[PDB]
Amino acid sequence: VDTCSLASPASVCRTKHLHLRCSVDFTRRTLTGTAALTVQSQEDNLRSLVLDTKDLTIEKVVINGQEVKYALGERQSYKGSPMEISLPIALSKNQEIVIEISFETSPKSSALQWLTPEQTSGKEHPYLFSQCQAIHCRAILPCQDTPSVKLTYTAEVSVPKELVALMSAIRDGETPDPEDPSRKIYKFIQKVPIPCYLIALVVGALESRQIGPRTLVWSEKEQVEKSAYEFSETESMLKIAEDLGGPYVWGQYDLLVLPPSFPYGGMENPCLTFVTPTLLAGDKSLSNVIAHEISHSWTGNLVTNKTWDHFWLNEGHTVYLERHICGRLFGEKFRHFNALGGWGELQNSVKTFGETHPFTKLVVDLTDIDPDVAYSSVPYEKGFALLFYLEQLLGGPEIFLGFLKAYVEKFSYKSITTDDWKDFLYSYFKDKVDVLNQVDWNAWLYSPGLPPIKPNYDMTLTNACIALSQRWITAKEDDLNSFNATDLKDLSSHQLNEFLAQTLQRAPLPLGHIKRMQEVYNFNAINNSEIRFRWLRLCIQSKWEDAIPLALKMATEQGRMKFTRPLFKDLAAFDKSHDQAVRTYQEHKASMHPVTAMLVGKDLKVD
Ligand SMILES: OCc1ccc(Oc2ccccc2)cc1
Ligand SMILES: [Yb+3]
Numbered sequence: 001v002d003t004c005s006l007a008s009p010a011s012v013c014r015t016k017h018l019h020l021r022c023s024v025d026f027t028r029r030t031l032t033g034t035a036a037l038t039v040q041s042q043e044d045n046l047r048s049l050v051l052d053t054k055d056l057t058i059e060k061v062v063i064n065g066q067e068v069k070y071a072l073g074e075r076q077s078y079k080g081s082p083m084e085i086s087l088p089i090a091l092s093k094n095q096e097i098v099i100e101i102s103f104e105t106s107p108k109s110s111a112l113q114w115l116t117p118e119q120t121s122g123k124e125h126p127y128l129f130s131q132c133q134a135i136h137c138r139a140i141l142p143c144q145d146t147p148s149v150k151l152t153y154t155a156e157v158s159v160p161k162e163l164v165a166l167m168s169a170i171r172d173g174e175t176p177d178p179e180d181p182s183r184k185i186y187k188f189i190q191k192v193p194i195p196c197y198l199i200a201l202v203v204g205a206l207e208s209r210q211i212g213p214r215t216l217v218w219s220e221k222e223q224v225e226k227s228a229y230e231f232s233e234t235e236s237m238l239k240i241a242e243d244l245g246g247p248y249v250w251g252q253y254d255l256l257v258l259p260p261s262f263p264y265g266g267m268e269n270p271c272l273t274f275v276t277p278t279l280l281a282g283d284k285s286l287s288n289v290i291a292h293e294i295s296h297s298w299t300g301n302l303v304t305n306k307t308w309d310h311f312w313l314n315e316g317h318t319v320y321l322e323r324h325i326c327g328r329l330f331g332e333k334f335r336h337f338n339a340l341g342g343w344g345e346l347q348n349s350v351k352t353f354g355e356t357h358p359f360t361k362l363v364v365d366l367t368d369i370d371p372d373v374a375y376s377s378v379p380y381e382k383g384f385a386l387l388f389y390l391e392q393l394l395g396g397p398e399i400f401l402g403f404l405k406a407y408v409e410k411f412s413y414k415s416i417t418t419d420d421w422k423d424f425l426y427s428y429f430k431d432k433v434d435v436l437n438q439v440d441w442n443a444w445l446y447s448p449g450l451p452p453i454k455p456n457y458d459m460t461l462t463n464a465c466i467a468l469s470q471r472w473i474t475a476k477e478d479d480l481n482s483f484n485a486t487d488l489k490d491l492s493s494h495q496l497n498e499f500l501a502q503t504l505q506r507a508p509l510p511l512g513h514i515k516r517m518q519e520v521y522n523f524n525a526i527n528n529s530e531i532r533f534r535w536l537r538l539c540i541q542s543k544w545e546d547a548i549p550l551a552l553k554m555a556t557e558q559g560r561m562k563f564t565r566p567l568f569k570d571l572a573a574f575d576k577s578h579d580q581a582v583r584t585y586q587e588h589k590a591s592m593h594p595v596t597a598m599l600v601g602k603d604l605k606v607d
């Protein structure tokens with residue numbers, strides 16, 4: 001039972017394949033076309049089925065060349081409207097049929113962002129991108145919008161000729177549109193079965209550069225060179241990930257660097273990972289996001305969560321694999337540094353929601369909860385903390401990686417629950433079940449707050465961050481003279497970020513301390529998005545009026561939610577910037593990503 005979907009469940013019928021034929025209309029901000037679903041009945045005498053939709057216009061439904069009866073139910077808030085289709089002939093178990101639905105999206109589709117030329121790097125062409133995770137595929141096309149159903153797809157997309165279309169699939173050629181010479185048709189094939197949240201589309205003035213044997217980086221012309229350099233470790237990461245998870249089955253591993261309003265750090269769209277341009281630090285320092293997206297090719301894309309309640313399975317295992325990739329590239333001390341940083345992020349999330357909040361539970365109950373509202377670091381970090389604890393309890397990384405590879409092999413091409421994972425963990429570790437029975441399963445999986453046990457972490461790389469943060473916190477006015485640019489000489493960008501993270505946990509600091517920090521460290525000159533974000537949060541919470549225009553600029557010039565949401569909230573919580581934060585949101589709302597616009601509105605209590 002998937003409480004987020006209104007469609008017929010996997011026990012009734014299963015979509016086996018999607019053949020999508022569509023045209024992108026920038027003037028109307030609509031995607032129009034036909035979604036032909038190959039549906040397999042899982043029941044005897046199947047006469048009707050239900051599909052998920054959200055703000056879709058249905059023109060007709062065709063089965064066996066004839067139009068059939070359908071009905072759109074009343075809208076159920078964020079879930080959309082159910083679409084019941086009357087089948088012309090009763091289906092027996094395992095019988096397949098093709099249902100072709102003629103549809104049109106709404107300009108307000110929660111899955112899409114339509115950008116004007118002014119909102120792009122080039123300023124001459126418009127741009128479109130999708131973001132289906134968790135339940136936005138229903139806002140693009142009628143489907144069984146649940147990760148419990150996996151399907152292959154083929155697609156032909158008609159776009160203005162001067163533009164390029166890309167999808168979460170293998171490129172299968174381009175031709176002039178035979179129905180319109182002002183347009184091109186781009187063809188795509190996804191031969192590996194995927195849950196529909198992994199369906200993705202981008203249309204814009206895109207250019208590409210090869211950066212590895214199976215990797216192209218894609219972006220507007222202005223970002224190509226910087227992107228090629230920033231993501232040059234991609235191939236070495238794919239090789240490490242293949243060694244940890246088994247064969248890479250997707251063919252290509254391309255990267256697309258989206259415009260700044262992209263709401264997430266990355267999206268593991270198969271064959272084409274989507275990334276935020278906020279990763280473009282110039283020194284490859286934010287490459288762990290690539291390692292994370294690469295890891296999803298095994299944990300999430302091959303082994304998938306059956307429902308959104310089990311999202312931690314996707315995230316926890318991915319962060320675990322991501323930290324191993326970074327550990328192989330940079331050393332075990334670095335994997336422990338990243339792991340310890342993750343615990344810090346988990347403390348922050350638990351503190352933000354409250355220790356008894358249901359969204360701090362590992363396995364969540366999303367009945368009547370919009371998944372976008374529940375989204376946080378909890379499934380990533382609590383999920384990671386559990387696996388890291390288990391690794392330590394079971395004999396170390398080598399032993400635990402053996403389980404991870406067996407888990408990926410066991411559940412490849414399947415959709416699983418926490419119980420399925422737990423059953424396999426007990427099966428694999430049958431000779432260590434006594435150790436496994438010491439785990440407080442009920443607390444780890446179903447209780448809110450911080451985990452019952454904190455793993456053991458090497459402190460080697462964290463010590464200097466803690467030591468510097470503590471000097472600043474315990475400093476009195478007469479100790480401020482002792483700080484100098486030399487304090488940072490031996491700190492990496494990651495350590496500088498951790499120093500800021502540690503200090504932010506104790507924010508506010510006295511205004512005089514923050515002014516001294518700028519005077520000696522010149523944190524205002526740092527363009528690294530993670531460091532700049534933490535520094536500006538530190539300034540705003542410490543009530544520095546000079547930081548107000550810098551924080552407003554960062555909150556609006558980019559739209560990665562990790563940054564935009566807390567910056568708007570910090571600005572709204574500071575009396576001096578409250579009105580500006582609200583008015584800036586109101587002015588930008590219409591041109592923001594629809595999900596980001598909704599969430600910032602809720603955060604700022606602006607309806
Ligand atoms: O485990 C908490 C939780 C959080 C979010 C969630 O759904 C998502 C997933 C990705 C993107 C947006 C929403 C499902 C579960
Ligand atoms: Yb081909």
Ligand SMILES: [Yb+3]
Pocket residue numbers: 476478479
């Ligand atoms: Yb003193």
Ligand SMILES: [Zn+2]
Pocket residue numbers: 292296314315318
């Ligand atoms: Zn992820």
